[PDB]
């Protein structure tokens, strides 16, 4: 009996609810699972006369518990939204039995430990949000082999490199912000199809920007700020025909910012502050345009306010890194 399997799953989960501030699971009683708050039923995909539990949505219920193995009984679930709860521990391996999983959002919880690799077992997975937890360690390179549309990893404790496989991803949005990723951006980044938004804010990346970034002609948001990149901006960035938001602040870039970049047609906010640029085109100057916002604070530019001192600048400016 199929809904009985859902009943057992949900009652095993409610037993694990230590604190439910909005009494969200109050009506989780009796065998009518479809009337449980946060449980969403639907016709079976292969038979519209059968009733199945197809979705779970407890977004913002602030529930402190964990996810028990018995949730593996919810074999018809394709939607799982538990943003902003206090679910703790790990994702049960039994969730590999949720073969219809399509959108999995455990953002802003108390999950911990290695990347939840059970997500790799879902053949229909499209949306994976694990941001704002305490996942850590290496990132499984095979994650970019799935046909995900959206990968949110930001604000965890992931470490080591961005996988060379990133160029395989079909994602329209990928976030890495606020982890402890290190090393270079892989040259394969140019091969990402469908990519619109990529966010690296606040990691420990370094090396030079790969010129292959210029192949991302559908990108609207490219934010590499608060890392440790060096070298010059690649001239290939003139290929970012769609970029709207571009942020390189808080790095160690050197050299010239040209109108190759500052006159990109959709570029409306270009932040390159806290670097060591020693020249900029006139069309890169903040306050110069009514359509385009620029920010050049704390660089090495003559005749601009709030620049770095000449004492601090000459050592770095006179020893540019050979991107090789």
């Amino acid at each position: 009996n199929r809904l009985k399997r859902a009943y057992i799953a949900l009652q095993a989960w409610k037993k694990a609810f230590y604190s439910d501030p909005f009494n969200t699971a109050a009506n989780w009683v009796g065998p009518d699972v479809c009337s449980y708050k946060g449980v969403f039923c639907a016709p079976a995909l292969d038979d519209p006369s059968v009733l199945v539990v197809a979705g779970i949505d407890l977004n913002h219920a602030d529930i402190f518990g964990y996810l028990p193995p018995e949730l593996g009984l919810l074999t018809d679930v394709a939607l799982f939204h538990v943003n902003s709860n206090r679910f703790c521990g790990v994702i049960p391996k039994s969730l590999s039995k949720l073969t219809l999983m399509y959108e999995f959002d455990v953002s802003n919880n108390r999950f911990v430990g290695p990347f939840p690799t059970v997500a790799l077992s879902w053949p229909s997975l499209k949306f994976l949000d694990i941001r704002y937890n305490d996942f850590e360690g290496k990132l499984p390179p095979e994650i970019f082999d799935k046909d995900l549309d959206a990968i949110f990893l930001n604000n965890n404790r992931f470490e080591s490199t961005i996988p060379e496989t990133i160029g395989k991803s079909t994602a329209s949005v990928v976030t890495f912000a606020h982890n402890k990723f290190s090393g270079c951006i892989p040259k394969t980044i140019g091969q990402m199809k469908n990519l619109n938004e990529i966010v690296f804010i606040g990691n420990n990346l370094s090396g030079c920007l790969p010129n292959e970034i210029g192949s991302l002609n559908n990108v609207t948001v490219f934010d590499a700020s608060s890392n440790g990149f060096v070298g010059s901006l690649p001239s290939t960035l003139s290929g970012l025909a769609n970029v709207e938001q571009m942020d390189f602040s808080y790095n160690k870039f050197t050299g010239f910012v040209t109108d190759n970049i500052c006159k990109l047609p959709k570029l409306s906010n270009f932040t390159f502050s806290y670097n060591f640029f020693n020249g900029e085109a006139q069309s890169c100057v903040p306050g110069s345009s009514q359509e385009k916002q620029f920010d050049d604070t704390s660089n090495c530019l003559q005749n601009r306010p709030n620049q770095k001192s000449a004492k601090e600048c000459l050592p770095v400016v006179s020893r540019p890194v050979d991107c090789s």
Binding site: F40, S84, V173, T175
Partner: peptide, 24 residues
């Protein structure tokens, strides 16, 4: 607004309608 930037707010989700796909 860009969802890549909104992802930086821990409380933000793509859809406020409980039970609906983020894609619908």
């Amino acid at each position: 607004r860009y969802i890549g930037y909104d992802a930086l707010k821990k409380n933000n989700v793509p859809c406020s309608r409980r039970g609906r796909s983020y894609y619908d």
